Every structure is written in structure tokens, then in C-alpha cells.
Design a protein around this ligand. Sequence first.
Ligand SMILES: *[C@@H]1O[C@H](CO)[C@@H](O[C@@H]2O[C@H](CO)[C@@H](O[C@@H]3O[C@H](CO[C@H]4O[C@H](CO)[C@@H](O)[C@H](O)[C@@H]4O)[C@@H](O)[C@H](O[C@H]4O[C@H](CO)[C@@H](O)[C@H](O)[C@@H]4O)[C@@H]3O)[C@H](O)[C@H]2NC(C)=O)[C@H](O)[C@H]1NC(C)=O
Ligand SMILES: *[C@@H]1O[C@H](CO)[C@@H](O[C@@H]2O[C@H](CO)[C@@H](O[C@@H]3O[C@H](CO[C@H]4O[C@H](CO)[C@@H](O)[C@H](O)[C@@H]4O)[C@@H](O)[C@H](O[C@H]4O[C@H](CO)[C@@H](O)[C@H](O)[C@@H]4O)[C@@H]3O)[C@H](O)[C@H]2NC(C)=O)[C@H](O)[C@H]1NC(C)=O
Ligand SMILES: *[C@@H]1O[C@H](CO)[C@@H](O[C@@H]2O[C@H](CO)[C@@H](O[C@@H]3O[C@H](CO)[C@@H](O)[C@H](O)[C@@H]3O)[C@H](O)[C@H]2NC(C)=O)[C@H](O)[C@H]1NC(C)=O
Ligand SMILES: *[C@@H]1O[C@H](CO)[C@@H](O)[C@H](O)[C@H]1NC(C)=O
Ligand SMILES: *[C@@H]1O[C@H](CO)[C@@H](O)[C@H](O)[C@H]1NC(C)=O
Ligand SMILES: *[C@@H]1O[C@H](CO)[C@@H](O)[C@H](O)[C@H]1NC(C)=O
Ligand SMILES: *[C@@H]1O[C@H](CO)[C@@H](O)[C@H](O)[C@H]1NC(C)=O
Ligand SMILES: *[C@@H]1O[C@H](CO)[C@@H](O)[C@H](O)[C@H]1NC(C)=O
Ligand SMILES: *[C@@H]1O[C@H](CO)[C@@H](O)[C@H](O)[C@H]1NC(C)=O
Length: 738
Amino acid sequence: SRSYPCDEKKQNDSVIAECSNRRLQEVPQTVGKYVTELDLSDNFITHITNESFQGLQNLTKINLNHNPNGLNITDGAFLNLKNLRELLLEDNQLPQIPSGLPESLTELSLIQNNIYNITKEGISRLINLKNLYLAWNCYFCEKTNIEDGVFETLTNLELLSLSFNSLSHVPPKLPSSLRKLFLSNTQIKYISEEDFKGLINLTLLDLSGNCPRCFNAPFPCVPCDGGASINIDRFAFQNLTQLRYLNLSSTSLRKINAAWFKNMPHLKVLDLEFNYLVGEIASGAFLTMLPRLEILDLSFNYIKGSYPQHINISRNFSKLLSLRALHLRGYVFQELREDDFQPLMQLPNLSTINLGINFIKQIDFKLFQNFSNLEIIYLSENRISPLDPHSNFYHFTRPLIKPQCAAYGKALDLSLNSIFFIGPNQFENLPDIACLNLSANSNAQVLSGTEFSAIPHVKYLDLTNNRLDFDNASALTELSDLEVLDLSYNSHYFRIAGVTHHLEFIQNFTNLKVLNLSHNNIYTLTKYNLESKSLVELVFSGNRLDILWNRYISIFKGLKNLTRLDLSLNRLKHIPNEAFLNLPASLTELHINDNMLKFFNWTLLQQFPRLELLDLRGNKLLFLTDSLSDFTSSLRTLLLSHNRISHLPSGFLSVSSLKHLDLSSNLLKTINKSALETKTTTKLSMLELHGNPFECTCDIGDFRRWMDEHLNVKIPRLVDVICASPGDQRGKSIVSLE
Ligand SMILES: *[C@@H]1O[C@H](CO)[C@@H](O[C@@H]2O[C@H](CO)[C@@H](O[C@@H]3O[C@H](CO[C@H]4O[C@H](CO)[C@@H](O)[C@H](O)[C@@H]4O)[C@@H](O)[C@H](O[C@H]4O[C@H](CO)[C@@H](O)[C@H](O)[C@@H]4O)[C@@H]3O)[C@H](O)[C@H]2NC(C)=O)[C@H](O)[C@H]1NC(C)=O
Ligand SMILES: *[C@@H]1O[C@H](CO)[C@@H](O[C@@H]2O[C@H](CO)[C@@H](O[C@@H]3O[C@H](CO[C@H]4O[C@H](CO)[C@@H](O)[C@H](O)[C@@H]4O)[C@@H](O)[C@H](O[C@H]4O[C@H](CO)[C@@H](O)[C@H](O)[C@@H]4O)[C@@H]3O)[C@H](O)[C@H]2NC(C)=O)[C@H](O)[C@H]1NC(C)=O
Ligand SMILES: *[C@@H]1O[C@H](CO)[C@@H](O[C@@H]2O[C@H](CO)[C@@H](O[C@@H]3O[C@H](CO)[C@@H](O)[C@H](O)[C@@H]3O)[C@H](O)[C@H]2NC(C)=O)[C@H](O)[C@H]1NC(C)=O
Ligand SMILES: *[C@@H]1O[C@H](CO)[C@@H](O)[C@H](O)[C@H]1NC(C)=O
Ligand SMILES: *[C@@H]1O[C@H](CO)[C@@H](O)[C@H](O)[C@H]1NC(C)=O
Ligand SMILES: *[C@@H]1O[C@H](CO)[C@@H](O)[C@H](O)[C@H]1NC(C)=O
Ligand SMILES: *[C@@H]1O[C@H](CO)[C@@H](O)[C@H](O)[C@H]1NC(C)=O
Ligand SMILES: *[C@@H]1O[C@H](CO)[C@@H](O)[C@H](O)[C@H]1NC(C)=O
Ligand SMILES: *[C@@H]1O[C@H](CO)[C@@H](O)[C@H](O)[C@H]1NC(C)=O
């Protein structure tokens, strides 16, 4: 009773089927009639008829995106499905909206299609529709033909997205129940008082990309004639009292009318990126009309040809009492003084200040102490010196600073700047910084224990992509509370023959939990051993453990409390038995992937009683031990993908703790009865076997019966478990055979 070709999983008593990216020519008739959600996306399906979903009467959600990776849908093909609530038909090259859609539809997505006419024959009958997506249809068809009153009968429509279409004007006769109206990149150059007549429950309005400021856009960008901006009438948003989100990004706006926000007391998010509002930032009457605004974005509003000495922030900025995040990227100015940010120091909830990509040469860092609740100071891509159609295409939605860093406390990001060395006055007059990012600064500082004395409570320090010298035993030891140190891609700049690398600084830390020394080109150590009582995770990938491997046999033996160790990309051909035995016994996860290991001594796993995860992927191993149970009694996950293993030993499954065995992309031709003969019951939950040259002859029948007898062992990617021989069964799955 194993499902094929879908990976069926019971989620909240509703069986879902994941049949995506499986190279399916047609809709499969081998799907259980009890499934509710079906995902047939990224397949080569070309035709949809009224017999495709025959028998599956409990289908509440159908996904047919990117088919074929156009789609021919007959009239009333989905009409038989009386329980269909969600239908996704994105990127299907549909010329028109499918006629005969079921009335029980609540969410319809027709994004990235060739739909030029929005007619009543395919839309008006769908009165239960709550969400309607019609983006990227008549994008770059001179204009989208919207039938007058096509959305009138949809009295339950809460979301209408007509983005990236040649609309030219807001469609009239829209339902009053509309909560979110998306009109981004719609060529609507004029907004009138009558355009949004009866939208009293409208909480979101997106009018971005209309008369745009072309700044490295991922989609075509054509500005309005004569540098014109979007023409919004004085009383256009006078009836939208419940507006919370207003997106006016890339609208070439030069002046903001404060009268727009007179009847908008709940406006929480205002987007004004890619405009020409430098004058509005300096005076702005509209700043007094936004008392409940929490997110304000005025990024990339710079004036061409000018690089002002200071940022001109209006005193009216003090009237944004609810402000939490201020985004001011791309303003482009030379210096930030304490007096420039005076109208922001009294805002009680302002926790995020985004000043990235501003080319600031010097900052008066004492001004940050003047703030009350600052938690994120993002200053990346500046000049500080020593001492997807479902995406937000204008606002930076991803976390400015990594969540694992910001969780420790006050976060300051000084990455991609001109701090080529840590000056003596580098961090003076700074708040109590708990997260610091000095990444990609070409920093060649010879660390000695005094550089971070002004900010000694840094718990997460990111020093990636620099030329730092940390050979001194006192390096970084002034950060007594340091928990996470990131030194990835650190190329030493002052290498001493009998000194580099000297990792003695690590043992001084009483609370260092995670150390990342990846891609540091560590081929020699000098006190050669690494010791630490608090270290839990060490990343030593992209180093030269092959050159090191008898002075470096017990290299990580002193890390008595280490649970995670990454030894990938070290060019290891053969790990010495004495060196492997001297690895920390406390290890729970060991990653020796992407190396060149020809042999692995499985007997050595006896000295690691807590080892649950063993990663040996991307290697050249040919043999497996026939008595793995005699060496381990805790190994829950064993990853051996992309190896040269051609035979599974007798009783390899007969280790009890093993719940995940990955033998994909190997050289296994067949799984014989000796390897499957288990007297004791196995506890395996997942067995990956795709990418193997299986012989689909009578020899594979023994393993075929084991798959039917053991339905608890989930085998993923059944369509990728391909037979190499014979010519008749070549290409077919091992589950589809006599
Ligand atoms: C102009 O400005 C407006 C306002 O900021 C932007 O509107 C946002 O647009 C994006 C993209 O269309 C919306 O993002 C999507 O939201 C969906 C709903 O999420 C909410 O609800 C769930 C619970 O149902 C919560 O868990 C969640 O926190 C939210 O509160 C998500 O389902 C979407 O997720 C899917 O897509 C993303 C991106 O591919 C994936 O990363 C996810 O894994 C997932 O597959 C997505 O997040 C956003 O909600 C809109 N805001 C509002 C308030 O509606 C405009 O986009 C912007 N215009 C332009 C052109 O930039
Ligand atoms: C230098 O080395 C360090 C240490 O290895 C790296 O930092 C770690 O990077 C990994 C990712 O490579 C981080 O792990 C990820 O954490 C995410 C957030 O975790 C929170 O949420 C989960 C629940 O979702 C909680 O359990 C957890 O406690 C946190 O609250 C997760 O979302 C990620 O999960 C995804 O990947 C894993 C596989 O890795 C899947 O199993 C998941 O299903 C999911 O897809 C992931 O776990 C880790 O947190 C980082 N540690 C620190 C200390 O920051 C550096 O990135 C590295 N530097 C460079 C330049 O490479
Ligand atoms: C410290 O600062 C550096 C530099 O700003 C941070 O590195 C940056 O991290 C982000 C997020 O991981 C990367 O963005 C992503 O890049 C990929 C590839 O281009 C893209 O596909 C994603 O959509 C996204 O934009 C960014 O490239 C990377 N920058 C560099 C130069 O490597 C780092 O994360 C910061 N560290 C902490 C602790 O916050
Ligand atoms: C649909 O689900 C119900 C249980 O919710 C079940 O009784 C019924 O037989 C199912 N019908 C089909 C056709 O699967
Ligand atoms: C600040 O945020 C809290 C919620 O975190 C809220 O209760 C409070 O009213 C906000 N203060 C102001 C002045 O907006
Ligand atoms: C805060 O800034 C004001 C000037 O804007 C200054 O007089 C005051 O001393 C500063 N206080 C601190 C603690 O930085
Ligand atoms: C190493 O650091 C200590 C402590 O700051 C310092 O006294 C010493 O001079 C440094 N060593 C070298 C070689 O600079
Ligand atoms: C091991 O590491 C954890 C996390 O850093 C720490 O809390 C614990 O005290 C350490 N245990 C010993 C015995 O050193
Ligand atoms: C494993 O290592 C031990 C020494 O620790 C050695 O005696 C044994 O022969 C090795 N086994 C293999 C298969 O190399």
C-alpha cells in the first residue's frame, strides 16, 4: 500500500499529496480518493479534462503551477469538484480565464498567464471568492480589458491583485468588502477621488511602480514622460479610514500632500522608496498626520549629482510617536552628527534604524547613546574609516542583522565599510553592544586584547571576510562574555613561519559556545592543541586537515564539551586511526562530508557513545561494515550519499537506533535477501535510494517485497529510483515492475 507517484502525508486528519517536480506527462489516476490537497506543480502536464480528478471528490486544494515546465483546460473540467476551495493556476500560458470554474472557489491564482480579458463568463459566477490573484498577465496586448462591473458580484472579495498589468486606470465598480487592493506597476498615472469610492473596509493599498524611478529593477522599468510623478487627487484617500498599509514606492513623487492622511488615523506601514522626497524629509507637513505609523521607509530618495555633508531630518519627525523602524537607505550623505538625529531620540518605540548604502564617511557614534529603545543599528555599505511574483520588490523584508546575533541584545552592523584596521577610538562612545558585525572590511588588525575594550559585552562577533591576525593568545579575550565567534574566509595577512596559526586564545573564553574557523586555510598550527570547557560547536571546513595529519593527532582532544564538529572540505584522503580516536567523545554530530575518503574505520565509532549523526556524503567510500551494531548503539542518522558503495552488507539494517539511512547517488545494483534478513524488528523511518544504477531484473524482486512489507520505512523520490538495466525497464522506477 505504498503511494506512487505522490508522497502522501496525513496533516491534521487531511491527507496531502506532494506530486510536484516528478516529470509527470498527465494527471495520475493512482492518487488516493481520500486526499484533500494535491500539488501537481512543475510537471509536464498539458491537458486538464473532467476525468483528471475523477473519484477525488474531497479535493479542497489543487496546485497546477508551471505546467508544462501551454496548459489546455476544457470547459467545466473542475466543475465536478464540489469541495474545491483553492485553485492555483500560475505560469500555465492560459490565453483566457478557464470557463466552468466551480462556485465553491475561495482562492484563485492566475499569475503569469496570457489572460488579456477579465470577463463575467469566468469571474462573475464565482461569488464565494475571497482572494483573486491576476498579476503578470498583460505586462509587456496594449491594455487589459476589464469588463465594466466584473468584480461587482464578488461581494466576499477581500484581496484583489491586478499588479504588473497594462491597466492605465483603476477598474471601477469594486466590491465594498475589499480589504487589500494591489495595483503595483499598472501604468496608472492619475488617481482621482472617485477611483476608490466605496472601499470603507480597505486596510491595504499598493500603488507602487506607477511613474517609476528606475533603480536596478528586476522587471522592466519605463519612467513617465517629462519626469512626471503619480498624480493623486487631494481627496483621493478621504474615504479610506481603515487604511493601515500604503505602498507608494517608485512613484517619482516630489511633494507629499498631507491632506491624503487626514482621514487615515490607523496608517501603520508607509512605503516611500525610490522617490525624490529629500525636500519632504527636510520639511514634510505629512509627518504630523501619522501618529500611529510603526514602519516608515524613505530609502533611495537621493538627489542626482549631490553628496550633501549632512542628512536634513525635519523636526516634525518627533511627531511619529508610534515609530518602530525607520528605513533611510540610499539618501547618500557624508556625515551624521548628533544634532541631525535630534527629532528621533525621544520616540519611545523606535528600535530599528536602517542607514545602509549611504556612503557616510564619518559618524558621531555618541548619538546612539541618546536613543531610548534602539536595538538594531544597521550601517552596512558605508564609508566609515579607522578611529518571484509573490515578493516585496521595493522594501527590504529580510532581517537586517541575523536573528541569532540580534537575540543577544543591541546589534550594530558595520560591515562593507572602509575599516581596514580597528583604530584605538573605533568603538568609543558606543552603547552596550551585544551583537557586532565587522564583515568584509579588508581588516588586517593584529588582535591583542584591547580593540574591543569600549564594548566588552559583545556576545556574537562576526569578523568574516577579513585579513585578521589572531595569533596572539590575548586576541579577543577582552570580550569575556563572547559566545559566538565567526571567522569564516579569514585570509591571514601577516603569516609568521613558526607562529601562524596560533589558536591559544580560544581556551581563555569561559562561555564561548560556537566558533567558525571555516575557509581559513589552516595548514599549520603552533601549544598545537585546541582546548575549551564551554565550546559546543566547531566549524573547521575549508581548511587543510590533510596536511596537518604526528604533532596534530590530538588537535581537538581538549574540546571536552564539543557536540558538533564540521570537518568538511579538508581534502582528507585517509583519517589516521590514532587521530580519529582522539576526537571528542561527547560528539553528537560529526560531519566529514565533501572530502576524498577512500576508507572509513567503523570500529572506531565504539569510543563515541553519544554520536547520533554521522555525515560521510561526497566521499569515495566503497565498503560498509557487516557488524555496525557491535560498534554503535546511538547512531540515529547516517548520511552516505554520493559515494562508491556497490554492496549493502549482510544484516546492515539488523543497528536498532538507526532512523535515517541515506544511500542515494551510490553504485548499488541490487539489495539481496541477506541484507534484508532481519530477525529483530528495525526502527528505520527513512531510506533514501535515488540515483543508484539498479538492475531491474528478477534480483530486484526480493527488495520490492521488502518495500511492501515495511510501509513504515518511508522511501522518498520514488520517481528518481531509476533502473539502469535492462533496456526495456531503463528509465522506469523500481516500484513499476513485474
Ligand atoms: C507594497 O507594500 C505592501 C505592504 O507591505 C506589500 O504587501 C505585501 O506583499 C507580500 C507579497 O505579496 C505579502 O507576502 C505574503 O504574505 C502571505 C500572507 O502572510 C501573512 O499571513 C500568514 C498567515 O496566513 C502569516 O503567517 C504571515 O506572517 C503574514 O502575516 C504569505 O503567505 C506569503 O508567503 C509565501 O511567499 C513568501 C515569498 O515568496 C515565502 O517566503 C513564504 O514561504 C510563502 O511561500 C507572503 O509572505 C505580504 O503579506 C503583503 N503585506 C500585507 C500586509 O498584505 C507589497 O508587496 C508591496 N509591493 C511591492 C511591489 O513591493
Ligand atoms: C559559521 O558557523 C556557524 C555555526 O555553524 C554558522 O551559524 C549557524 O548557521 C546555521 C545554518 O547554516 C543556523 O541554523 C539554522 O537556524 C535557523 C534558525 O533557528 C531557529 O529556529 C529553529 C526552529 O526553526 C530552532 O530550533 C532554533 O533553536 C532557532 O530558534 C533554522 O531555521 C535553520 O533550519 C533549517 O535548516 C536545518 C538544517 O540546517 C533544517 O533541518 C531545518 O528544517 C531548516 O530547513 C537552521 O537550523 C545556526 O542557527 C547558526 N548558528 C549561529 C550560532 O548563528 C554560520 O552561518 C557560519 N558562517 C558562515 C559564513 O558560513
Ligand atoms: C554581516 O554582514 C554581512 C555583509 O553585509 C552579511 O552577509 C550577507 O548576508 C546576506 C544574508 O545571508 C546575504 O544576502 C543574500 O545573498 C544571496 C546571494 O547573493 C541572495 O540570493 C539572497 O537573496 C540574499 O540577498 C549577503 O549576500 C551577504 N553579504 C556578503 C557580502 O556575503 C552577514 O550576514 C552579516 N552577519 C550577521 C551576523 O548578521
Ligand atoms: C470524503 O471524506 C469523508 C470524511 O470527511 C468520507 O466519509 C468520504 O467517504 C470521502 N469521500 C471520498 C470520495 O473520498
Ligand atoms: C509601543 O509598543 C507597545 C507594544 O510593544 C505598545 O503597547 C505601546 O503603546 C507602543 N507605544 C507607543 C507610544 O506607540
Ligand atoms: C543627549 O543629546 C543631547 C543633545 O541632543 C545632549 O545634551 C545630552 O547630553 C545627550 N545625553 C547623552 C546621555 O548622550
Ligand atoms: C600580545 O598581546 C599582549 C596583551 O595585549 C601584548 O602585551 C603583547 O605585546 C602582544 N604580543 C605581540 C607580539 O604584540
Ligand atoms: C558544556 O557546555 C554548555 C554550553 O556551553 C555549558 O552550559 C556546560 O556547563 C558545559 N559543561 C561542562 C561540563 O563543561
Ligand atoms: C581500525 O583501527 C584499529 C586501530 O585503532 C586497527 O587495529 C584496525 O585494523 C582498523 N580497521 C580497519 C578496517 O582499518
